[PDB]
Amino acid sequence: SMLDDAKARLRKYDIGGKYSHLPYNKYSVLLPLVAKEGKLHLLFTVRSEKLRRAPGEVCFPGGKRDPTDMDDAATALREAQEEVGLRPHQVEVVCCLVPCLIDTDTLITPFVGLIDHNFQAQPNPAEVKDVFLVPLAYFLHPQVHDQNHIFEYTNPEDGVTYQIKGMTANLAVLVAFIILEKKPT
Numbered sequence: 142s143m144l145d146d147a148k149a150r151l152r153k154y155d156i157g158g159k160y161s162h163l164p165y166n167k168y169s170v171l172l173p174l175v176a177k178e179g180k181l182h183l184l185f186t187v188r189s190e191k192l193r194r195a196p197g198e199v200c201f202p203g204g205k206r207d208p209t210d211m212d213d214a215a216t217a218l219r220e221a222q223e224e225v226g227l228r229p230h231q232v233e234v235v236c237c238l239v240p241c242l243i244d245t246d247t248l249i250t251p252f253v254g255l256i257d258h259n260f261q262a263q264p265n266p267a268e269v270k271d272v273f274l275v276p277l278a279y280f281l282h283p284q285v286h287d288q289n290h291i292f293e294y295t296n297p298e299d300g301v302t303y304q305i306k307g308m309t310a311n312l313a314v315l316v317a318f319i320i321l322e323k324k325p326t
């Protein structure tokens with residue numbers, strides 16, 4: 142099936158806990174995969190304009206590890222619940238992708254999660270101004286604008302354009318390559 146095939150592909154890139162104990166300032170993100178209309182999509186947030194760090198930017202759900210978290214995956218799931226109302230029974234964490242090193246002292250660990258078909262986002266306006274889907278296939282043929290490369294995605298439902306860039310854009314392309322490369326039509 143589409144979903145079994147995606148999970149099987151993703152598992153080949155799982156680093157698991159290999160980098161998880163290193164003494165960094167630790168953050169996790171969830172890359173949430175949603176199946177709609179026979180195709181996979183990624184779920185993105187737009188950060189609230191009132192936040193200190195990166196107001197109004199397109200990001201994945203996530204945030205800083207706290208003492209309650211059993212592991213890095215728990216961080217991602219806790220933050221996703223707080224930001225968009227995703228409950229743990231509504232997500233299957235499939236794998237942990239290559240971490241992202243920044244600022245010399247920070248390690249961001251991305252987890253890919255398959256999202257239940259009955260989940261409906263409830264954006265928390267203290268954290269997130271918007272939540273939206275992009276088809277995974279978009280990231281194979283994006284609309285690129287240079288400012289460094291920025292992706293512009295226009296939602297055909299409403300005509301709204303979102304700008305996706307940096308780590309977030311790079312991770313989206315990675316997931317699209319992993320799942321969609323070399324597939325019969």
Ligand SMILES: *CC(=O)N1CCC[C@H]1c1cccc(OC)c1
Nearest residue numbers: 168195198199200201202203204
């Ligand atoms: C958009 C984005 O992913 N950002 C904004 C702040 C830095 C980065 C980030 C890094 C780790 C966790 C985040 O939580 C979503 C965000």
